[PDB]
Design a protein around this ligand. Sequence first.
Ligand code: 6HF
Length: 286
Amino acid sequence: SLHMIDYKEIEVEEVVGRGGVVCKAWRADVAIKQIESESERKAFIVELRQLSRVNHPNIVKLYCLNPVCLVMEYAEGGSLYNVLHGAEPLPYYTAAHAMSWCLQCSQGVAYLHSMQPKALIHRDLKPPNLLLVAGGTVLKICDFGSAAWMAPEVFEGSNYSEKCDVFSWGIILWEVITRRKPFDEIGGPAFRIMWAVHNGTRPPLIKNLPKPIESLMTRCWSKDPSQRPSMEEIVKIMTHLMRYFPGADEPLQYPCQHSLPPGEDGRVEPYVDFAEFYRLWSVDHG
Ligand SMILES: C=CC(=O)Nc1ccc(Oc2nc(Nc3ccc(N4CCN(C)CC4)cc3)nc3[nH]ccc23)cc1
């Protein structure tokens, strides 16, 4: 379903980073990653079979076979990780942006869980794989250590299902609300986090978190994957909550010297402010 390109047609510009290697650059802006060594071919081709079927707003759009190369939509905004924890100066964002991002993420993952004949599992949902465009207001996923966002049945070898992507989304929800790195204090190598999560450890709960949001977030954290909601249920819930989070379309433009309080009492302070939420919620309820 794709569209070949002549390699001479592309004009390289700059380098971006490694997920292969991605480079900035066609027909008057695109992002491309050339393959390195034949070991990645057998995977590189799969991505092609997948992305060519995919067509969704919140998933990176896939626009050469000699040399093997991909030409994808360029995300001028960068990764969500760089927005939350990247280089100074960091941008200010609101509760509306946190919820909007997560919603758009669930929208894109639900489209994957609905593909026929078989569903597609991302299996590596984390902010570094979530790109932003339109002034940081639109989120797009790119399938192309993940211990913090990995469901406990995944790294235990148990035959997992798409519900592993739900667990990740739940962690991503806690990350944008607190603007913290999940299990940053644990540290050490990857296995020290797997042991913690495997034992039931989850991120600390959030002061003043709305019970509707605290409920959904933890339901996604449940050990039993069958007690986790489906993405379709997340999309629906998140869609209805956006009614209490206006201003998602406002771009990121203001800086933010952000102080990080330490995790005191196993209960952290959110970065976003839920004042406007409770206010709008009292209006409808009463
Ligand atoms: C810190 C984690 C991280 O950046 N991960 C990451 C993920 C993908 C990636 O490649 C892409 N980038 C982008 N946009 C983009 C991504 C990152 C960046 N920079 C900006 C400068 N610097 C802060 C590093 C990150 C600039 C633009 N669009 C893409 N479309 C298809 C692939 C692709 C490049 C990097």
